[PDB]
Curated annotation (Swiss-Prot), chain A:
Record note on quaternary structure: Component of the ESCRT-I complex (endosomal sorting complex required for transport I) which consists of STP22, VPS28, SRN2 and MVB12 in a 1:1:1:1 stoichiometry. Interacts with STP22 and MVB12.
Outcome reported for the amino acid change (mutating residue 43 to R): Abolishes ESCRT-I complex assembly; class E phenotype (malformed late MVB)
UniProt family annotation: Belongs to the VPS37 family.
Originating species: Saccharomyces cerevisiae (strain ATCC 204508 / S288c)
Localization in the cell: Cytoplasm; Endosome; Late endosome membrane
VPS37 C-terminal domain mapped to chain residues: 1-64
Residues of the full protein shown: 139 to 202 of 213
Name of the protein: Protein SRN2
Swiss-Prot record, chain B:
More info: Present with 1420 molecules/cell in log phase SD medium.
Domain VPS28 N-terminal intervals: 1-100
Protein name (record): Vacuolar protein sorting-associated protein 28
Its biological purpose: Component of the ESCRT-I complex, a regulator of vesicular trafficking process. Required for normal endocytic and biosynthetic traffic to the yeast vacuole.
Recorded family membership: Belongs to the VPS28 family.
GO terms (BP aspect): ATP export; protein targeting to membrane; protein targeting to vacuole; protein transport to vacuole involved in ubiquitin-dependent protein catabolic process via the multivesicular body sorting pathway; ubiquitin-dependent protein catabolic process via the multivesicular body sorting pathway
Source lineage: Eukaryota, Fungi, Dikarya, Ascomycota, Saccharomycotina
Molecular-function GO terms, alphabetical: protein-containing complex binding
Compartments it resides in: Cytoplasm; Endosome; Late endosome membrane
Outcome, altering residue 18 to D: Abolishes ESCRT-I complex assembly; class E phenotype (malformed late MVB)
From Swiss-Prot, chain C:
SB domain segment(s): 1-58
Note: Present with 1360 molecules/cell in log phase SD medium.
Source organism, top-level taxon: Eukaryota
Shown chain mapped onto the complete sequence: 325 to 382 of 385
Subcellular location(s) of the protein: Cytoplasm; Endosome; Late endosome membrane
Chain's role: Component of the ESCRT-I complex, a regulator of vesicular trafficking process. Binds to ubiquitinated cargo proteins and is required for the sorting of endocytic ubiquitinated cargos into multivesicular bodies (MVBs). Mediates the association to the ESCRT-0 complex. Required for vacuolar targeting of temperature-sensitive plasma membrane proteins STE2 and CAN1.
Name of protein: Suppressor protein STP22 of temperature-sensitive alpha-factor receptor and arginine permease
Consequence the record notes for mutating residue 21 to D: Abolishes ESCRT-I complex assembly; class E phenotype (malformed late MVBs)
Quaternary structure (record): Component of the ESCRT-I complex (endosomal sorting complex required for transport I) which consists of STP22, VPS28, SRN2 and MVB12 in a 1:1:1:1 stoichiometry. Interacts with HSE1 and VPS27. Interacts with MVB12 and SRN2.
This protein's domain notes: The UEV domain is required for the interaction of the complex with ubiquitin.
The organism's taxonomic lineage, starting at the top: Eukaryota, Fungi, Dikarya, Ascomycota, Saccharomycotina
Protein family membership: Belongs to the ubiquitin-conjugating enzyme family. UEV subfamily.
């Protein structure tokens, strides 16, 4: 009740950490995935997703 | 609460306007940087910039101009009111010409 | 409550995207103009977000 408590803090702090790593990691790879996008249809879908993603990054980062 | 349910129909149009003024400023600043890293070439740069610099003056010198300067005054200022960083832009703006 | 919290992320996120677009433009990926269009459409969006915070943070 006392330990489990102060250890719920560590409990999350580590797993969130990973997502963050994971997300930034992703956006770098996603940048490398950059092709013959003349499809302004697909460029938008790339944007949408990068944006979408980054939102999730900062949101997490924020917590801590 | 996104839009205040007591925000003038005419005001809604004014926000939309600022959103454009903003849009110009931050965008321009990049263009310029890109040109100082050759990414874009002169031919390209001078048209596009000139174009922007023109567009800007128009937004302010729109019919509903009062409200602009009003809640969102003289420009170097408005750049601070909003967390906006653009050390190039602010020179490309206050000087109304690109290549010089 | 988290209405703002969630919004905050957007402002940063957008900034991050536009930066990326810039990098993309530098390495040629997009034509020198598509950048402007896509860029402005993002910035414009951003402004609203930022200003939207002013509503709350005021």
């Amino acid at each position: 009740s006392d330990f489990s408590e102060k250890y719920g803090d560590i409990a999350l702090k580590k797993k969130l950490e990973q997502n963050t790593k994971k997300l930034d990691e992703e956006s770098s790879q996603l940048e490398t995935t950059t092709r013959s996008i003349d499809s302004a249809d697909d460029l938008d879908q790339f944007i949408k997703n990068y944006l979408d993603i980054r939102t999730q990054y900062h949101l997490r980062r924020e917590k801590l | 609460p996104l839009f205040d349910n007591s925000i003038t129909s005419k005001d809604k149009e004014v926000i939309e306007t600022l959103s454009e003024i903003y849009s110009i400023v931050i965008t321009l600043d990049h263009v310029e940087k890109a040109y100082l890293k050759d990414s874009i070439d002169d031919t390209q740069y001078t048209n596009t910039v000139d174009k922007l610099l023109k567009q800007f003056k128009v937004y302010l010198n729109s019919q509903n101009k009062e409200e602009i300067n009003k809640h969102f005054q003289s420009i170097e200022a408005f750049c601070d009111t909003y967390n906006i960083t653009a050390s190039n832009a602010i020179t490309r703006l206050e000087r109304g010409i690109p290549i010089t | 409550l988290n209405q703002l919290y969630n919004l905050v992320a957007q402002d940063y996120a957008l900034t991050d995207t536009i930066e990326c677009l810039s990098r993309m433009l530098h390495r040629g990926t997009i034509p020198l103009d598509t950048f402007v269009k896509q860029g402005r459409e993002l910035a414009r969006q951003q402004f609203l977000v930022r200003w939207h915070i002013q509503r709350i943070t005021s």
